[PDB]
């Protein structure tokens, strides 16, 4: 009886944390940037199996499927710009003048029709052609008219392809055979530490890649309470990925009615300009209902005292400073890249104690620098008609302040930057494990 | 092997975001490059080779 | 100061270069070795 012998068991449930290559599984109209048509057709009715009595230690900050998704999205955003036009012939002395039609004094001097010379079909003839550019794309040359595109001092851009659409489509990240994706189905999970109820899944849920700056949009809400997460909340050099439990609806619009006009800059390649603005010109904006925004700020400030003391003055401020894509709620809304000024949402002071909206004014650019690279820009072609999108503000990306002397006041000013936090607000539940079958265990038997 | 001049780069911009690293100036006096092979230990290895040849 | 061994082995060639703007030119110079430049019209 005591004479135990080794036995092997193949196909035994045991895993170890690992890193692999995951593949997208979006479902299978104009193609989009995330090429969610070379993805394995989504397996429906996925087999989420509840794993009982198991307690796995998660971590959303040293996770690696959020470092993999980022490089996937980058290398997948670049591959959709190779076939598209390269706007090198456009770097030329323009001659801009303010648009002459009814312009509200807020949008005064934000558009200019710059008339330049362009190469024809024939490498020897020139054509005097004009277009409409935004003030954030032209830069004056000789301050003593005569503007020039903003990026003729660094890399030249590759105009996107008008057939390709930037609309984010849900992507399911699958794990290859022999691996498993463990999700932490648990309500009050602050991001690290053990998770007393884990489950197995083959493909993560729809993670639509949106690229916002300081307000996570169209995300997935928390289950019961506004969950605040950070690496070490006591540190003031790590962002604080707040996540709401009820969405704050934000209405962003661009009220001008543009009109495209394709200009031919070479043999069989066109540059889609903006010929005319029909009507009167009016500033873009976004509306966030003041009631349901102040209420969610109250919820957040209540959950921010569980980490900072109940008698703590928590006040918000507007962004600190820097580039336009970090001090401003940048995003894209139907193919037009807005840069909104959130200094109206983040302005309040909280102490331990209708039907109006908060119109934040947005700017618009066409020369964009995604992922903050040096030698890469990208002209976004114009979009015709009034643009209007209705989003959900799901989370924030706050940053504490290094206020010393233990002052009872704490300022939280928003801040974006690396896009990784956008995914990390969705890939916090998941971790990828490597199944290690073939265990060895002793029992009372002997091979003949 | 040595090159005794002291060059000085100077990047020239030839297009949109792409540079051409030129040579702006030579500081000092200009002197020919060269290499030194010790004549004793080179003639000796030539002797070895000619013996094996 | 050039040692007569290295005499005529370097030359500062000053050309016109395209600027940021496809229409403006800049008079810029550099230093090339004699094994990179080739005279054009033997009659600078």
């Amino acid at each position: 009886a005591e004479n135990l012998w080794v036995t092997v068991y193949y196909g035994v449930p045991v895993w170890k944390d690992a890193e692999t290559t995951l593949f997208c599984a979006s479902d299978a109209e104009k193609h989009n940037v995330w090429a969610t048509h070379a993805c394995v057709p989504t397996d429906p009715n996925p087999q989420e199996i509840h794993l009982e009595n198991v307690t796995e230690e998660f971590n959303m900050w040293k996770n690696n499927m959020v470092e993999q998704m980022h490089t996937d999205i980058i290398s997948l955003w670049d591959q959709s710009l190779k076939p598209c036009v390269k706007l090198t012939p456009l770097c030329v002395t323009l001659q801009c003048t303010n648009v002459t039609n009814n312009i509200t004094d807020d949008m005064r001097g934000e558009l200019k029709n710059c008339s330049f010379n362009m190469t024809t079909e024939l490498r020897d003839k020139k054509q005097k052609v004009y277009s409409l550019f935004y003030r954030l794309d032209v830069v004056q040359i000789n301050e003593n008219k005569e503007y020039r595109l903003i990026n003729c001092n660094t890399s030249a851009c590759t105009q996107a392809c008008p057939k390709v659409s930037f609309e984010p489509i849900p992507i399911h990240y699958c794990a290859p055979a022999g691996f498993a994706i463990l999700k932490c189905k648990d309500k009050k999970f602050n991001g690290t530490g053990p998770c007393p109820s884990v489950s197995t899944v083959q493909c993560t849920h729809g993670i639509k890649p949106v690229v916002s700056t300081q307000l996570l949009l169209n995300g997935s809400l928390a289950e019961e309470e506004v969950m605040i997460r950070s690496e070490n909340i006591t540190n003031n050099a790590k962002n604080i990925l707040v996540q709401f439990n009820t969405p704050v609806q934000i209405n962003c619009t661009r009220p001008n009615n543009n009109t495209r006009k394709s200009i031919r800059i070479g043999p069989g390649q066109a540059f889609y300009a903006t010929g005319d603005i029909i009507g009167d010109i009016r500033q873009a904006h976004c509306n966030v209902s003041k009631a349901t925004w102040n209420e969610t700020l109250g919820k957040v400030v209540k959950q921010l005292r569980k980490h900072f003391g109940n008698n703590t003055i928590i006040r918000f401020a507007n962004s600190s400073g820097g580039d336009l894509e970090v001090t401003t709620h940048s995003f894209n809304c139907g193919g037009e890249f807005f840069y909104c000024n959130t200094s109206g949402l983040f302005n309040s002071t909280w102490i331990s104690n209708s039907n109006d909206s908060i119109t934040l004014p947005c700017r618009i650019k066409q020369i964009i620098n995604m992922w903050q690279r040096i030698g890469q820009c990208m002209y976004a072609p114009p979009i015709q008609g009034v643009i209007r999108c209705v989003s959900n503000i799901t989370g924030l990306i706050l940053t504490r302040d290094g206020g010393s002397t233990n002052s009872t006041t704490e300022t939280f000013r928003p801040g974006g930057g690396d896009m990784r936090d956008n995914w990390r607000s969705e890939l916090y539940k998941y971790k990828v494990v490597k199944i290690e079958p073939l265990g060895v265990a002793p029992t009372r038997c002997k091979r003949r | 092997c040595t090159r005794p001049n002291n060059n000085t780069r100077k990047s020239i911009r030839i297009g949109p975001g792409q540079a051409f690293y030129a040579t702006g100036d030579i500081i000092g006096d200009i002197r020919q490059a060269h290499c030194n092979v010790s004549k004793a230990t080179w003639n000796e290895t030539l002797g070895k080779v000619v013996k094996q040849l | 100061n050039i040692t007569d061994d290295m005499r005529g082995e370097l030359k500062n060639c000053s050309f016109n270069m395209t600027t940021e703007l496809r229409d403006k030119k800049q008079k810029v110079y550099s230093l090339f070795y004699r094994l990179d430049v080739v005279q054009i019209n033997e009659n600078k």
Partner: nanobody
Amino acid sequence: QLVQSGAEMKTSGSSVRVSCKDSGGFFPYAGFRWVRQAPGQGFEWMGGVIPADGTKHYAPKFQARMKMTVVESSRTLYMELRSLTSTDTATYFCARLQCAGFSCEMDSGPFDLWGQGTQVTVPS
């Protein structure tokens, strides 16, 4: 223009990290220098970094104390001075070598573009 971090105050032994962000490009084209100015007496060479080839060149004095890095994403130079002292109080500048049009010096020129300064005071 180059813009630096705000004036700071540290303790004798702590490490100070200055920063220098250049709005306007010039990162892969020119070579930058780190120069500190003791109160009311001249300048003092302290480093130099060409971010095109990534070559750093520390002064012999501040060879073991400091280290400077580059971040191409945000286009920022950092200079972290580790072993502070009562005599390291100075205004810290980041400069840029001369650029004559579109051809920028990378190795040796006169500094033509300066930063505003970062007054680091360390009393002890």
